[PDB]
Structure formats: structure tokens, C-alpha cells
From Swiss-Prot, chain A:
Note, other: Present with 238000 molecules/cell in log phase SD medium.
Keywords: Cytoplasm, Ribonucleoprotein, Ribosomal protein
Function recorded in the entry: Component of the ribosome, a large ribonucleoprotein complex responsible for the synthesis of proteins in the cell. The small ribosomal subunit (SSU) binds messenger RNAs (mRNAs) and translates the encoded message by selecting cognate aminoacyl-transfer RNA (tRNA) molecules. The large subunit (LSU) contains the ribosomal catalytic site termed the peptidyl transferase center (PTC), which catalyzes the formation of peptide bonds, thereby polymerizing the amino acids delivered by tRNAs into a polypeptide chain.
Keyword Signal: no
Main location: cytoplasm
Identification of the protein by name: Large ribosomal subunit protein eL8A
PROSITE patterns: RIBOSOMAL_L7AE
Organism: Saccharomyces cerevisiae (strain ATCC 204508 / S288c) (Baker's yeast)
Lineage of the species this protein comes from: Eukaryota, Fungi, Dikarya, Ascomycota, Saccharomycotina
UniProtKB/Swiss-Prot annotation, chain B:
Summary of subunit composition and partner proteins: Component of the large ribosomal subunit (LSU). Mature yeast ribosomes consist of a small (40S) and a large (60S) subunit. The 40S small subunit contains 1 molecule of ribosomal RNA (18S rRNA) and 33 different proteins (encoded by 57 genes). The large 60S subunit contains 3 rRNA molecules (25S, 5.8S and 5S rRNA) and 46 different proteins (encoded by 81 genes).
Organism listed in the record: Saccharomyces cerevisiae (strain ATCC 204508 / S288c) (Baker's yeast)
Keywords: Cytoplasm, Ribonucleoprotein, Ribosomal protein
Shown segment, full-protein numbering: 62 to 114 of 121
Compartments where located: Cytoplasm
Protein name stated in the entry: Large ribosomal subunit protein eL34A
GO molecular function, one term: structural constituent of ribosome
Broad class of where this protein is predominantly found: cytoplasm
Stated family: Belongs to the eukaryotic ribosomal protein eL34 family.
UniProtKB/Swiss-Prot annotation, chain C:
Recorded name of the encoding gene: RPL25
Top-level lineage group: Eukaryota
Family: Belongs to the universal ribosomal protein uL23 family.
Subcellular compartments: Cytoplasm
Keywords tagged on the record: Cytoplasm, Isopeptide bond, Ribonucleoprotein, Ribosomal protein, RNA-binding, rRNA-binding, Ubl conjugation
One Pfam family it belongs to: Ribosomal_L23eN
Cross-link (Glycyl lysine isopeptide (Lys-Gly) (interchain with G-Cter in SUMO)): K40
Organismal lineage: Eukaryota, Fungi, Dikarya, Ascomycota, Saccharomycotina
Transmembrane segments: none
Protein name: Large ribosomal subunit protein uL23
UniProt key word Cytoplasm: yes
Biological source species: Saccharomyces cerevisiae (strain ATCC 204508 / S288c)
Subunit composition and interactions: Component of the large ribosomal subunit (LSU). Mature yeast ribosomes consist of a small (40S) and a large (60S) subunit. The 40S small subunit contains 1 molecule of ribosomal RNA (18S rRNA) and 33 different proteins (encoded by 57 genes). The large 60S subunit contains 3 rRNA molecules (25S, 5.8S and 5S rRNA) and 46 different proteins (encoded by 81 genes). uL23 is associated with the polypeptide exit tunnel.
GO terms for biological process, alphabetical: cytoplasmic translation; ribosomal large subunit assembly
UniProtKB/Swiss-Prot annotation, chain D:
Cross-link (Glycyl lysine isopeptide (Lys-Gly) (interchain with G-Cter in ubiquitin)): K45, K92, K118, K144
Major place of residence: cytoplasm
Record GO terms (molecular function): RNA binding; rRNA binding; structural constituent of ribosome
Native organism taxonomy: Eukaryota, Fungi, Dikarya, Ascomycota, Saccharomycotina
GO cellular component: cytosol; cytosolic large ribosomal subunit
Protein name as it appears in the record: Large ribosomal subunit protein uL2A
The gene coding this protein: RPL2A
InterPro entries: NA-bd_OB-fold, Rib_uL2_dom2, Ribosomal_uL2, Ribosomal_uL2_C, Ribosomal_uL2_CS, Ribosomal_uL2_dom3, Ribosomal_uL2_RNA-bd_dom, Translation_prot_SH3-like_sf
Similarity comment text for this entry: Belongs to the universal ribosomal protein uL2 family.
RNA sequence: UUGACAUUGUGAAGAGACAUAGUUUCUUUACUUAUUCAAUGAAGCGGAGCUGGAAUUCAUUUUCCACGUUCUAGCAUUCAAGGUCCCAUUCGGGGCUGAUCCGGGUU
RNA sequence: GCUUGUGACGGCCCGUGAAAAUCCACAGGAAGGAAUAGUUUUCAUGCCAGGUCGUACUGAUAACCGCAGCAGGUCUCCAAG
RNA sequence: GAUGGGGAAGCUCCGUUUCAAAGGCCUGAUUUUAUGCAGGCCACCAUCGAAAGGGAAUCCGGUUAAGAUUCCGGAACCUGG
């Protein structure tokens, strides 16, 4: 107002240097970025077979939280905790004279791919969690089928990393309960039920459905309009 | 030239040591009329946008 | 939330932290002693006849000097080895592959006196 | 025998283009946002001879839309464009000599120059002195435009491919007899090393299919097959007719 | 140079058989992510929407283009002046708006 | 007058007759700056320092190349009556 | 002619700004302190290649058996600080 002036600029071609904007959409990314993005793209443009594709259908976030909440009680020993227990044993055991049985029956989540597989094969697993990332997917694609056949209730769950955290590994690939306190026996029946409904029951039908075959959006709209005007005059 | 005082490198007009005076008459004149004629064009098409 | 805002469409290599070297053992066990001290720099009076005359007449000392030595090093060594003050130092490479320094002392010193202090004639 | 002259050419040792004095390559503006939605103005700042070329170059400078600076371009001057002229470039440019416009935006009959073969290729068609292309039709669905090149050839290219209104300067350069060996000398001295020319019929057999014999002569048809091989292709390659052309040429 | 096979995938219409159900194979014309070519210091792409209006309303929009620069050999840069909200009023400095929204497919 | 330099011009070309380091100028106006005392080193004068390698001589009917102190060959500046 | 790279059994061949996350300046932030982060730039992306091309600055007189625009005398000029 005072000796202050309004002087709107004109950024409309042929005059005034263009201002700074967000060229985020346009940056020339390092190849490694480009490749992991195109890897994802290319991976759904292709029609993807039913035995893959059956992943992608991951567990939902509410049930998961309930499943992580249970599976967490049963974390395996911590190094301190086990050091703590070995002096409970070796001292007291080899003295007051217990049968390496002044230690309680441990209850813990079972892990390690090879381990869970023989567990599943032996019908000992009672709830299994398969991560959805696992880049050599082969490590793990046979597992829905496995569980399905061995009559084992399973779930494809978001987080190889997160499976890792509830077992003190960086990543984990699989988690499983063979065991359970009676204090928890019942809360798991419910979990095995919701899960079996979202997976095992659905498995035979999921086996028929290829995934992928998805256009990029510039192609999508190019047809959501081509096909709209063509027919509906 | 870096050995010699600033006044060997200019004349004391706008665009001193750079453009040749007559070339700067031209610049001033041309600037002025065009900035004037710009006022003109605006108010003319302002009237076109109000009477049509 | 959402994504950063890059005004530039160039992506440049992130400015990352650069730790200085902090070894675990050393380079050499023992640092090399000075490789060009004064006594290595100036090797010998040049006592040629026509050298001698520059001493008499030009208040100039002529030394054969290290090939590895420059005008600074010659000046400092003649200064430290003889208590003298140096005006300026010309040098040249001889054709026997050795270096000559023409060393002009300042007007306060008398090179003739100074040449039979070092002890030659 | 020996590797003949026209094969040695390709390794470009003594045969590369003499380049030192050249103004720089001639090119339309990079096809940015201005030129394909609006127009952008420049001034031809200098029109200038370019060694080895026959048509003069136009040096034309524009403001930079995204940064405070001038950006200069090298055009080939169409006849009649001049220093201090304003040059307009873009989809929505107006139809005068010197401007650059996409063939989609010009009526048939339009006479253009330095036209692109694909949009954005910064110009490829009709650049030599005197030359031009005529727009002779449009096909608005699948936006192509159909033009006639200087060779007589008709061709259809994208309607976004650009060109500049008018003809290239320096016409009729070839109307004038070179007169002497020396003028050819200086001609090619600024081009490449193609002059003068020994007839293969004057060489020995080692040197050429035409070489040798106790009289000079080709000794076999000099119309050579397309499928001939390196070392063989000398004379009338792939010639579908031969002999003095009688009667009017011109593509019907 | 010519053919076949491999790189080689996805729709659609038409032919081709167990001999007028669709597994399969060839031809035509679609798709784009493989592969291929160009451009650029990957800058304005695609899709909506704002407002002008041509347009004629068969109930209200059924749409289609537009949607800052052309007398002149000036000038166009300091996240932008303006508006507005903050820091606790110091000089300095920040956010939004100015410059519509969505999708990160550089084209 | 001779040699050389240089200027203002004129002829010539389908030939129109390098590049980079480097130096200055201008447009811009971020900023900084006085009255009880500030601004200024593109004005003058003043102080210190400038390393390293080559430098002799021949350059030709004998110092180079032609087996040689070979009538051969080998780029150039200065130029009196 | 290196380098990210691409060929080649390989000695190596190609490419030179190329299908690359390619780097360093100005001062401000420190008054634990020495240089971490705060701005904004600049994206120019090796290097070798001329003792006749480009290019900061020196002249006269004297002097040696043999050096000298290089020493001596005197008088200057440039570049950095
Ligand atoms: Mg526990
Ligand atoms: Mg003056
Ligand atoms: Mg001023
Ligand atoms: Mg004396
Ligand atoms: Mg020397
Ligand atoms: Mg070349
Ligand atoms: Mg020749
Ligand atoms: Mg001939
Ligand atoms: Mg001929
Ligand atoms: Mg012959
Ligand atoms: Mg032959
Ligand atoms: Mg033959
Ligand atoms: Mg013959
Ligand atoms: Mg004949
Ligand atoms: Mg074929
Ligand atoms: Mg681009
Ligand atoms: Mg002469
Ligand atoms: Mg001329
Ligand atoms: Mg100047
Ligand atoms: Mg500031
Ligand atoms: Mg001064
Ligand atoms: Mg000499
Ligand atoms: Mg002699
Ligand atoms: Mg001789
Ligand atoms: Mg190489
Ligand atoms: Mg060099
Ligand atoms: Mg030189
Ligand atoms: Mg030189
Ligand atoms: Mg003398
Ligand atoms: Mg002497
Ligand atoms: Mg001599
Ligand atoms: Mg002196
Ligand atoms: Mg003096
Ligand atoms: Mg000074």
C-alpha cells in the first residue's frame, strides 16, 4: 500500500522467466532407482501366473496386528536371558541334582525356512506366517500348497523384515507356532479361523486367477475414454 | 587494461564504455515509446473486453 | 505424508561424510632426517682462477652446490654456514653435470676476507 | 589386386570432412514447451557465410524460458530474411518467410525449408542452397502431412514435424561455370578430399575393375548389380536404365 | 540376400481339426512391458476442473473449440512484488497465496 | 629514392580466409557505509618476494645428413655507392 | 588419450561427454574450536599436443681469453603479497 506496489508477473510463454516449480516428476534418477521402479512396473504389465499372484493377496492390517500381538509373547530367548538360564541350569542342575529340568518347557515361535518346512511336513506347525517379499520368491512359493496339503492353517503376511523383528533377526521369511500356552490356546483358534477364511479356504479358487495384465495410467485413461465414446454415443 | 585507471575504460554516460552513445539514444527512445505504447494496447483491448 | 520437492531435475551424488585417516600402524617407523641440510647444499668452494677474481672484485662467493638445491636453499645455507648476508644468488648448471652458485654478498661483507676465513686462496 | 579408391574412402583418414572453419551445425530450436503450445520470438542477429556450405547461415537469438540468459541458434537463412528481423517459432506462429511452424499449421501450397523428418529432429529436409519442400496435402486423422521433396519424391511425415517458411538462400549457385580447374580446387578444398578424379579406365588392373588393356575401355557392362560386393561396385550401380535421357522428365 | 527356429509377449475379428461345444495352429489389425530409434543440464505429460464463448436447449446441458506474448535491432535474473498468516517484534526470517486438482509413465 | 612499418580505401571468391587461456567493460543492485565522525586502495607515495631447466660454439665447398674435412642435400632475419 | 561403460579367448579394440549418483568456489555459521553446517549459486565432467600460433613485465652504457637484453653501472616495468 504505502510506497509499496503491486506488480503481478506474467509467466505465460514468450515473456518472464518461468519460476521455480516442482520438477520432481521429471528428475533423471540414478539407474538403480529406475530399475527397481521398472522392475515393479514390468512385473504387472505381464500376465502373472496364479502360483505367484496368489501372494499380492496379503493379510489385512487389523488381523495382522492381532497376530503379531499374539506371536510376540512367544519371542525366542535373548542372549542375556539364555546366559541367565545357563547359570540357572549348569550350576543348580549339576548340584542340587535336577535332570537338566530345573528349566521350564520353552514356548517360542519357530522360524528358519528349512525348519518350518519339516515342521509343516510333520503336521507340527499350527499357524504359519509367510512373508510377501522374499525376492527369490521360489524359497517360499511352494508353501501355501504345502500347508494346504498338510492341513496346515497359514497366512501371507506383510513384512519379511517384520517377521524378523519378532525373532531378533533383521529379516525372517517365516514364523510359526507349533506350541501354545493354554492361556493362549483359545485366542489362536480365532486367529486360525479368520486366517483360514482369507487363505486356505480361498486357495483352490486363487489357483485359477492370473494376476497382472495392468496398464499404466496414460494407457488406462487412453482406453477408459476410447471405449467410452466408441460405444455409448 | 588491468594496469590502468578506471577512467581509461569508460565515458560517464549510461552504458559508458560499452555502447556508443548514438546507440544509447536509440535505446532510450525505443524503450520509452514501447513502454508507452504498451499502456496504449492494454486500455484498447480493455475496451474490447467491455464493448463487443 | 508425501514427497520431497526438488526444483532441479538433475540428481547429484549426495554430499556424504568423509572420515580422516586414523591408522593403526605408521608409514615408516622413523621419519627421514633432513635430506638437504646446509652441509649437503653447498658442497665445495669453486676456486678456479676466474672464480677467484669474482671474489676479489665482485664481492661474490662461488660455491659448487647441490643439484637438488634452489636459490632459496643456497641463500639460506650460505647465510647459516658463514654468518654472511646475501644480496642475491645466481646459479647455473656446469657442463660436468654439477651446479655453480654465484653468491653476491651485501655491501657490509667483504667476500675476500670471508674466503680465507673458510680457508681458501 | 589392390583395394580400390572408393573402398579406401570409408576408413576416413585423408577423407574426412574439412571442418575447421565451419560455423557450427545448422539446427532448429529444440522442440520445447514454447514452440509446441505457442510461439517464441527471436532476432536474426547476423546472417553469415559458412565455409563449404553454399547457403548462408542465419544466427538467431532467443530468450531462455527457464533461465535469465540468451540462447543463440544457427539457422539456415531463407531468402529474404534479414538482420534485425523478428523470427517467430511455434505451433501458433504466423505464416511469414523466416518463421518456423509445424506443417500441420500451414495450408497446402505452403513453401517450406529445413523441415524435420520426425518431430524434434531439428531439421533434415531441403537445406541446400535454393531448395525447398511443398506441402501438398493433409490427413487430420492420424495427423500426417504429405510433402514433395526437392528430389521429386513425395513423402508423408508427422504434422508436428517443423519447417521454416520460404526457400533457402543462395539460389542458382550452380548456374555459373566453374571455368577453371582452380575454382574446383578451392571448392573442394573447403569440403572434403574428393578432387580431382582419376578415371579407373586410366589405372592398371591392380587398382580397379576398369584398369588395364592395350586401349582404354571397360571391357564389361559398367552397370553393376546391387548385390555386388565391395571392390566390385564401380560405375552405374543398380542402374535401371542408361543412355542419354530423351524427353521430359518430371514425376507424373 | 532368402527361409526356418530361438529372442516372443497380450487382446480382437476371420480361417484351420477330435469329425456345427474350444485346447491348438496359421492370416488380417489392435495392445505395450521385451527389443529398436530419437531428444533434453529428463520442464510443463496424461487425466479432471476453473472461468470466455461459438453452439441449440425438446428439461438442463446432449457437447465442441478455445482458456496471458506479433507496428519498432530497448528492458525481462536476487524463493516475486502484492495479499495474508506466523516468530513475540530488531534486523532478520518463515508458511500459504500469487502459480487450480489428481497420477510420480522425462518426452 | 631503397627497405620496412602503418593507415584510409579499392579488387577478388560456388575460396569470404583458427581456437583457447587470459584481461577489461557494462547491465544489475544483494549488501555495506557518516557528523562528533565514517566510506574509500581501479589516485599518489611507501614495504617484501619472484622458484625450476636451457643459455658456450658451428649452422655449413670442414662442427648437421650423404661410410669422409664428399663440387650433393638441408627452414630463416638484417642488406651500402 | 585415461575414466563409468560396450566388444574381445586374450595381447587389447571402441567411445571422450559418451545409457554415469562424475564436483569446488565464495563467504557465512565458531567465540567449547577448530573448521562441522547454514544460504545461494556454477553443472564447466580428465589429461597430453606449438622453443614459428595465442601470451604480464627491461632498456641503454661498460665489462671477458671464452658469458651476457642473464654480470657490473644506471634507469625502469610486471605479477603476487
Ligand atoms: Mg519371554
Ligand atoms: Mg574515458
Ligand atoms: Mg549506476
Ligand atoms: Mg674490494
Ligand atoms: Mg638459469
Ligand atoms: Mg571429423
Ligand atoms: Mg587430392
Ligand atoms: Mg578424370
Ligand atoms: Mg572423371
Ligand atoms: Mg597406365
Ligand atoms: Mg580386377
Ligand atoms: Mg568385373
Ligand atoms: Mg580395361
Ligand atoms: Mg574408352
Ligand atoms: Mg519372415
Ligand atoms: Mg525431456
Ligand atoms: Mg624481405
Ligand atoms: Mg572480409
Ligand atoms: Mg575494454
Ligand atoms: Mg542476505
Ligand atoms: Mg594502486
Ligand atoms: Mg650466444
Ligand atoms: Mg665452418
Ligand atoms: Mg658437402
Ligand atoms: Mg581409448
Ligand atoms: Mg600443454
Ligand atoms: Mg609458445
Ligand atoms: Mg609461441
Ligand atoms: Mg653490451
Ligand atoms: Mg667471465
Ligand atoms: Mg660470443
Ligand atoms: Mg642491473
Ligand atoms: Mg635503482
Ligand atoms: Mg602491487
Amino acid at each position: 500500500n504505502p510506497l509499496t506496489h503491486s506488480t503481478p508477473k506474467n509467466f505465460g510463454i514468450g515473456q518472464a522467466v518461468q519460476p521455480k516449480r516442482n520438477l520432481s516428476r521429471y528428475v533423471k534418477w540414478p539407474e538403480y532407482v529406475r530399475v527397481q521402479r521398472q522392475k515393479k512396473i514390468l512385473s504387472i504389465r505381464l500376465k502373472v501366473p496364479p502360483t505367484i499372484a496368489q501372494f499380492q493377496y496379503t493379510l489385512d492390517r487389523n488381523t495382522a496386528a492381532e497376530t503379531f500381538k499374539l506371536f510376540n509373547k512367544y519371542r525366542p530367548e535373548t542372549a542375556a536371558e539364555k546366559k541367565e538360564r545357563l547359570t540357572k541350569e549348569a550350576a543348580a542342575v549339576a548340584e542340587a541334582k535336577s535332570k537338566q529340568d530345573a528349566s521350564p518347557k520353552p514356548y517360542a515361535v519357530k522360524y528358519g525356512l528349512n525348519h518350518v518346512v519339516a515342521l509343516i511336513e510333520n503336521k507340527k506347525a499350527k499357524l504359519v506366517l509367510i512373508a510377501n517379499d522374499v525376492d527369490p520368491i521360489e524359497l517360499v512359493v511352494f508353501l501355501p500348497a504345502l500347508c494346504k496339503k498338510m492341513g496346515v492353517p497359514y497366512a501371507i503376511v506383510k513384512g519379511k523384515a517384520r517377521l524378523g523383528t519378532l525373532v531378533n533377526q533383521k529379516t525372517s521369511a517365516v514364523a510359526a507356532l507349533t506350541e501354545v500356552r493354554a492361556e493362549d490356546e483359545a485366542a489362536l483358534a480365532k486367529l486360525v479361523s479368520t486366517i483360514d477364511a482369507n487363505f486356505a479356504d480361498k486357495y483352490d479358487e486363487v489357483k485359477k486367477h492370473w494376476g497382472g495384465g495392468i496398464l499404466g495410467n496414460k494407457a488406462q485413461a487412453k482406453m477408459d475414454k476410447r471405449a467410452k465414446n466408441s460405444d455409448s454415443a | 587494461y588491468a594496469t590502468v585507471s578506471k577512467t581509461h575504460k569508460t565515458v560517464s554516460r549510461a552504458y559508458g564504455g560499452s555502447r556508443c552513445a548514438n546507440c544509447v539514444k536509440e535505446r532510450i527512445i525505443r524503450a520509452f515509446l514501447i513502454e508507452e505504447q504498451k499502456i496504449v494496447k492494454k486500455v484498447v483491448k480493455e475496451q474490447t473486453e467491455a464493448a463487443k | 505424508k508425501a514427497l520431497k520437492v526438488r526444483t532441479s531435475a538433475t540428481f547429484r551424488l549426495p554430499k556424504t561424510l568423509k572420515l580422516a585417516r586414523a591408522p593403526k600402524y605408521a608409514s615408516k617407523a622413523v621419519p627421514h632426517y633432513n635430506r638437504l641440510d646446509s652441509y649437503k647444499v653447498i658442497e665445495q668452494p669453486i676456486t678456479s682462477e676466474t672464480a677467484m677474481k669474482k671474489v676479489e672484485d665482485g664481492n661474490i662467493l662461488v660455491f659448487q652446490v647441490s643439484m637438488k638445491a634452489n636459490k632459496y636453499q643456497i641463500k639460506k645455507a650460505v647465510k647459516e654456514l658463514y654468518e654472511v648476508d646475501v644480496l642475491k644468488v645466481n646459479t647455473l648448471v656446469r657442463p660436468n653435470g654439477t651446479k655453480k652458485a654465484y653468491v653476491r654478498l651485501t655491501a657490509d661483507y667483504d667476500a675476500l676476507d670471508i674466503a680465507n676465513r673458510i680457508g681458501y686462496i | 589386386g589392390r583395394v580400390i579408391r572408393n573402398q579406401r574412402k570409408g576408413a576416413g583418414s585423408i577423407f574426412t570432412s574439412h571442418t575447421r572453419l565451419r560455423q557450427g551445425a545448422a539446427k532448429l530450436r529444440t522442440l520445447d514447451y514454447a514452440e509446441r503450445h505457442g510461439y517464441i520470438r527471436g532476432i536474426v542477429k547476423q546472417i553469415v557465410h559458412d565455409s563449404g556450405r553454399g547457403a548462408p547461415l542465419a544466427k538467431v537469438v532467443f530468450r531462455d524460458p527457464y533461465k535469465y540468459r540468451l540462447r543463440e541458434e544457427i539457422f539456415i537463412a531463407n531468402e529474404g530474411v534479414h538482420t534485425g528481423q523478428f523470427i517467430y517459432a511455434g505451433k501458433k506462429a504466423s505464416l511469414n518467410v523466416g518463421n518456423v511452424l509445424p506443417l500441420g499449421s500451414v495450408p497446402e501450397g505452403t513453401i517450406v525449408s529445413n523441415v524435420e523428418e520426425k518431430p524434434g529432429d531439428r531439421g533434415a529436409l531441403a537445406r541446400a542452397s535454393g531448395n525447398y519442400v511443398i506441402i501438398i496435402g493433409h490427413n487430420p486423422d492420424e495427423n500426417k502431412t504429405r510433402v514433395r521433396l526437392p528430389s521429386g519424391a513425395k513423402k508423408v511425415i508427422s504434422s508436428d514435424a517443423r519447417g521454416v517458411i520460404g526457400v533457402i538462400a543462395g539460389g542458382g549457385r550452380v548456374d555459373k561455370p566453374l571455368l577453371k580447374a582452380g575454382r574446383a580446387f578451392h571448392k573442394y578444398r573447403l569440403k572434403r578430399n574428393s578432387w580431382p578424379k582419376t578415371r579407373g579406365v586410366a589405372m592398371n588392373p591392380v587398382d580397379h575393375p576398369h584398369g588395364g588393356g592395350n586401349h582404354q575401355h571397360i571391357g564389361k557392362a559398367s552397370t553393376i548389380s546391387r548385390g555386388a560386393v565391395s571392390g566390385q561396385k564401380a560405375g552405374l550401380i543398380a542402374a535401371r536404365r542408361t543412355g542419354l535421357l530423351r524427353g521430359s522428365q518430371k514425376t507424373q
